[PDB]
Design a protein around this ligand. Structure first.
Ligand SMILES: O[C@H]1[C@@H]2CNC[C@H]1OC2
Ligand SMILES: O[C@H]1[C@@H]2CNC[C@H]1OC2
Ligand SMILES: [Cl-]
Ligand SMILES: [Cl-]
Ligand code: NA
Ligand code: NA
Ligand code: NA
Ligand code: NA
Lengths: 659, 659
């Protein structure tokens, strides 16, 4: 065996297979190679008859493993072998393992691939590495899926219904699959993932130039590999996360940097990526943003209100659209009746054309002067205000619809025919914003802006146009926000609407929400609930009780998103948000989320600590549970230590009034 | 154009295409043929090169339409033409349209298909028929997806977040697809579906011998047909539901009977099917079941308690398993402290072997005598009791695991390797129940039984074994329930645990729950909430507020499903169910659900009328809303007229307790 070693790690590379193990020398923990098939990597390629096949590259005809430098091992897998015994003659995969001379860091890189007469698709490399043994390791996979989740590597007590779904999912296809980087759907918002047990943690950070997918396997024994054969899997239940290098598409550097943390968990992983986040330029603190714009301080303790008038989906829809007089009266009631001290008022439906033509201010809704009166009222309260804006849609029901503003692919076919909200080519969108945004800022005297859709993902295609638009909006120095966000956009915005959780999502029945994104970026970007899943709606992600408590634990602001006719039904939740969440949001707004912990066996009792000196303990389940010292946290209850040392305790109650 | 006609319907058939329209003469509404491509049918078949393709059979080389009897039109489609212009020589499809002499019923049947050298797969016939024009017809598709849903054919006011998800789904792939009949997953529980507008309704009943799939299209303009071509759809947004005849599989009669109802909606459709359900033998009323077994009357007003001890998933799991003394104390507390007058206690975890070996009563949990003390206490209260039973699983973690009792297919491959709870061939399952169920009945003096899994679906494979097991269980004459159920199993059981809603399901963001199954079968089978989505858990289907109100509107009983450690947190929901749901469930239990109505434009206020003289009005949304007479229904509120003349009014309230 070839050995790479420094003061902290020993890398044992098998010269016959290319598989490697990593010994973390201070804990003695040994991270293993693929426990199922001893595969260094899993390559998907076409065979001589053209059918896609997936092969173990450790079964290649020739495997070369040599130490080409002091801390570098080069590997070459030559002529993989198909299941029928034929050979992909002329296919080769070259990789490298590079141990940092000093730190507990191992770089793994696919350096070259040769495809011969075959076509190469996916490469899982390293394959099924750094795994946890289910119900032996007591730890978790760590996945920054949107705000982030952990997946425990063992079965634990929980509500009986949740338990049945959890355990069942670890045995069927719900616990295996892949996710992508930097989308607003089911995918990841940070280019890292990892695993930990009680002894140590490992995480891999993907090179800034690459876009692998992430394969997950959450306590599954690989039965999915044998269902088509109709045999029972002979493998052990394990947790693993693998990079999927898309050899057919990838033109970046196929490198992942593994960091090994003794005694670490998801918090320590986030802090390690935080250092890389700063080096990549994503991290621009809220304090720097506040120095540039003092109106940023209208955000701490503010409730985000979206008054949804059926727009952009429809123009002046009956029964949903608000007039500007009705808009003004809602703002007045929020301030005078509901005593909301700080607010971001977001009015969806102020223009008489469909987006992307965000103008003129609608005469049918009352006209420019009536909208200005509503905005002037909000500004007299110290509220932030923005209308709904979007420069990316191209809607079938718009009379101005045209494919001329749409993008076409290499075949000349229209792109995003099935995604109406992102049909305009980003290279056109600054020009669209330029048509009226400066007129609206000037006329209404705007201090804030929120822009929809365009910055919800970070894809390569069109990024230059999106950066152009981001720079244009940011040049106005308004307190600005955007839908969902991604880390690459943090320098340009003050708040993200979203960066929480999809309602329907892979892993939902076998994961726990964890504030991975905010553990990295809470100092640099404020987030609020997503408008489709706001704190006033009851969804897979909870009711107001659960969402308010998770808000304080994770460091996000309250979102109240409603059609005008619902307003009277919103008052009780606006009041509870004002009383409970807003003061904590205010105190913690600029701080670092230093730590998050799970404090109960069922993961429902959690504790967050912010660098403001604020501590939030909350219990997101129905039954009172005790923590260290025998302190009891009531069901749907909280125990909050404020910066001045005062202690807030309480709980939500659902009751039935009968006349 | 060939015409079939009686006093109630005019059927207009086009001689060139085979498309037909139906004029419903009482209202004058005309059901048009395929508004998109003038396709009588859509046939999926392989071409001369073996590529699957889908063709418009109205483009066939020869189409023959002849009136072959007084009320029969025969159609033949000969030699379909592919996209390239090649002919499928030797392929033909023969159909018939048969108008009933007196009634507004039209039978449509695929009588014959010939493949030649090609292979035929799916036939949509009739294609895109009985459609609604989006935002023109105000009405809905009607789909018995589990308990049932309707899908409005027009946009309407609703919560802003819901509105965005709803409308977006009508423009992407969430609003098109297919469902299957008689599964416990995403599919249909009754073999019919329909569409209605403000003038007229049509519904189709699938022949008892057939198993088509159901294609749905909910306000989609067919963009999914064009995304791969990268062009915009030229078609209108419409709602349709189509049969998908599986020509490669179907051995039954490929017939669907359409019934036409002037002024009808989903209630009328359900009552039409209720007649057919009695003809099919499914309908055995709860009153006859009570005549056979007086203890059935322990069910009305009973809360279904599932005490989930981590079993069947694990044997004596630490932190989840209950002892029999602990079980007895939970029962005592439910009765003496929580004052629950009627209950079905279901104890998950009483045996020391894994299912399918439901024995012996566990010594580790306390032994048979202590279990008997728990059951005797429950019986002294008048409660029903059952242990958890299952005869279908074969679990990887069972020391007794063997493939001996699993089914194999013609190639010798194990079946259900991907579905651990349903692996024992049903032909063995009665034998497995015979091992101990009679010993448990006589030792514990059981009055009740619940059996898991085996009756959650109705597939052809193994149904004879399942009937054998159901007949055996029914021969004991216990008050008996089963998981989920299907209409074919109603004769053998008193209650179904489930028959409500999956949490994540196709159409969830573009449909409203409707009590379609209970509109048919409430007099014949009692149902309770599903254990994975019980009334004490907050999910996509609501919190306790929403679920308790829906329970009374739909006519189902409360389900409280909890791990033992959660019990103290269940107290407030048990009390609220006891005071609000239980008296209404008790009164309406044996009755017909005569009618259901949506009374608000957002469909959140609803009214159900039961033949016991009970009227339930409830508001499943947060804001108070007015109905006829200016009566106001509070948010999460109810107005219930009882048989004894009392009017129950009230509402749920969430309150924040800050100490
Ligand atoms: O997990 C599921 C499975 C089937 N029925 C409900 C639960 O129990 C076994
Ligand atoms: O429906 C969605 C779409 C994108 N942003 C949120 C909502 O508004 C437009
Ligand atoms: Cl959150
Ligand atoms: Cl229900
Ligand atoms: Na999957
Ligand atoms: Na800004
Ligand atoms: Na779909
Ligand atoms: Na019975």
């Amino acid at each position: 065996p070839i050995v790479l070693e420094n003061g902290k790690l020993n890398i044992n590379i098998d010269s016959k297979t290319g598989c490697f193990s990593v010994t973390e020398k201070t804990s003695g923990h040994v991270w293993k190679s693929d426990p199922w098939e001893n595969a260094a990597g899993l390559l998907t390629l076409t065979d001589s008859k053209g059918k896609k096949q997936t092969v173990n590259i450790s079964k290649s005809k020739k495997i070369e493993v040599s130490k080409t430098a002091k801390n570098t091992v080069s590997l070459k897998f030559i002529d993989p072998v198909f299941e029928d015994g034929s050979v992909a003659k002329g296919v080769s995969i070259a990789t490298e393992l590079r141990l940092d001379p000093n730190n507990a860091q191992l770089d793994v890189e696919v350096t070259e691939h040769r495809s011969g007469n075959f076509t190469l698709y996916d490469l899982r490399y390293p394959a099924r590495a750094f795994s946890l043994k289910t119900d032996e390791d007591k730890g978790a996979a760590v996945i920054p899926q949107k705000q982030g989740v952990i997946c425990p590597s063992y079965i634990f007590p929980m509500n009986g219904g949740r338990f049945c779904k959890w355990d069942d999912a670890t045995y069927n296809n719900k616990s295996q699959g892949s996710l992508e980087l930097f989308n607003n759907g089911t995918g990841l918002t940070m280019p890292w993932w990892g695993t930990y047990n009680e002894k140590s943690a490992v995480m891999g950070i993907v090179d800034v130039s690459a876009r692998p997918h992430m394969q997950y396997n959450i306590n599954n024994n690989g039965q999915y590999l044998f269902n088509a054969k109709g045999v029972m899997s002979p493998y052990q239940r394990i947790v693993f996360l693998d990079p999927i290098w898309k050899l057919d598409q990838e033109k970046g550097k196929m490198r992942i940097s593994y960091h090994f943390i003794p005694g670490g968990d998801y918090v320590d992983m986030a802090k390690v990526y935080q250092k890389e986040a700063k080096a990549r330029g994503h991290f621009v603190s809220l304090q720097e943003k506040l120095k540039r714009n003092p109106n940023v301080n209208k955000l701490p303790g503010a409730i985000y209100f979206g008054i949804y008038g059926g727009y952009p989906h429809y123009v002046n829809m009956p029964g949903m659209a608000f007039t500007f007089d009705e808009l003004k009266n809602i703002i007045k009631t929020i301030h005078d009746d509901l005593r909301v001290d700080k607010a971001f008022v977001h009015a969806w439906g102020t223009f008489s054309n469909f987006v992307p033509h965000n103008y003129p201010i609608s005469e049918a809704l009352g006209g420019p002067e009536k909208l200005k009166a509503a905005v002037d009222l909000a500004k007299s309260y110290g509220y932030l205000y923005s209308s709904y804006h979007a420069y990316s849609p191209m809607l079938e029901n718009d009379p101005n619809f045209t494919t001329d503003l749409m993008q076409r692919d290499a075949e000349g076919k229209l792109m995003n025919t099935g995604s109406r909200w992102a049909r305009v080519d980003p290279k056109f969108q600054k020009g669209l914003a330029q048509k009226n945004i400066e007129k609206e800022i000037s006329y209404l005297g705007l201090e804030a802006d929120i822009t929809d859709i365009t910055f919800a993902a970070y894809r390569e295609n069109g990024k230059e146009g999106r950066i152009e638009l981001a720079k244009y909006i940011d040049s106005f120095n308004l307190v600005n926000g955007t839908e969902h966000g991604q880390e690459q956009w943090i320098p340009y915005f003050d708040m993200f609407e979203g960066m929480t959780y999809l309602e329907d999502r892979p892993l939902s029945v076998i994961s726990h929400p964890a504030p991975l994104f905010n553990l990295v970026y809470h100092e640099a970007i404020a987030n609020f609930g997503k408008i489709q899943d706001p704190d006033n709606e009851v969804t897979a992600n909870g009711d107001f009780r659960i969402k308010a408590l998770r808000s304080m634990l994770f460091g996000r602001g309250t979102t109240i998103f409603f059609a005008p006719y619902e307003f009277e039904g919103m008052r009780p939740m606006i009041e509870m948000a004002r009383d409970l969440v807003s003061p904590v949001h205010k105190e913690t707004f600029y701080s670092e989320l230093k730590s998050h912990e799970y404090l109960s066996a069922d993961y429902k009792v959690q504790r967050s600590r912010f660098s403001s000196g604020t501590e939030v303990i909350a219990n997101l389940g129905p039954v009172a549970q005790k923590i260290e010292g025998g302190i009891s946290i009531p069901g749907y209850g909280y125990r909050i230590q404020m910066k001045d040392g005062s202690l807030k305790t309480g709980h939500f109650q659902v009751s039935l009034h009968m006349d």
